[PDB]
Amino acid sequence: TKYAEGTQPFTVLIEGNIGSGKTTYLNHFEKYKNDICLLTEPVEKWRNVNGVNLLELMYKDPKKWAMPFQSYVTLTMLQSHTAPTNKKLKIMERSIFSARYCFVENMRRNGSLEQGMYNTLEEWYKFIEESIHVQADLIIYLRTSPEVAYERCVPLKYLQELHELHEDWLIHPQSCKVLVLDAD
């Protein structure tokens, strides 16, 4: 009864802070193109919504554009999450879950998302779990230290905030199995 229920293979979610080596990690699998479904984070889509670059706009003026940006990120995640495939294994770089628990939650904390905006997104997150099937069998957490992530130009404080949020979500509900890797 939920959309895309029973249409997805075993699904692996690569999660990690900015600069935890996620793109590198997903590339290792590229020689298996033919047997694995590989979906990188849809940044390209965020950079071009029928011509509009939502990513730049968000950097430019977060108070105004964080809401539409995160709303759109959420959508793209669903698009990946529910995309059909005949492959027997599927790996995604980030997910609806990182978007909600890390990026949106952080924007609330630093007040990029005002109360009304945050709540609209949250209400959508709740409706999404009732209505849309998000296949998630294993998270692979490329755990790092904010400082190491820093070496590979977002501020360091931001990376620490995001680090704590990934730590809260993945180490300290979701009874999906997590696999911690030292990416230091």
Shortest spacing between CB 34 and a second copy, in angstroms: 27
Shortest spacing between CB 44 and a second copy, in angstroms: 14
Helix (H) or strand (E) run with residue 90 in it: strand 89-93
30 is catalytic: no
* Rounded CA separation 142/48 (Å): 28
Tell me the backbone φ, ψ of residue 15, rounded to 5 degrees: -115, 155
Confirm or deny that 20 is annotated as ligand binding: yes
- 116 part of the interface to a second copy, by CB under 8 A: yes
Q: Within 58-117, which residues bind ligand AZZ (CB under 6 A)?
A: 70, 73, 94, 98-99, 103
H helix count then E strand count, the chain? 9, 5
Contact between 157 and 164 (Cβ < 8 Å): no
Confirm or deny that 24 is annotated as ligand binding: yes
Confirm or deny that 22 is annotated as ligand binding: yes
Cα–Cα nearest to 99, from 81, 117, 128, 77: 77
Q: Which is nearer to ligand AZZ, 7 or 48 (CB)?
A: 48
Contact between 155 and 118 (Cβ < 8 Å): no
Q: Which residues are annotated binding-site positions?
A: 16-24, 41, 59, 70, 94
Residues carrying an active site annotation: 93
Give the binding site for a second copy (CB under 8 A): 1-5, 7, 49-52, 54, 57, 64-65, 67-68, 71-72, 75, 78-79, 82, 115-117, 119-120, 123-124, 127, 130-132
Q: Which residues are annotated binding-site positions for ATP?
A: 16-24
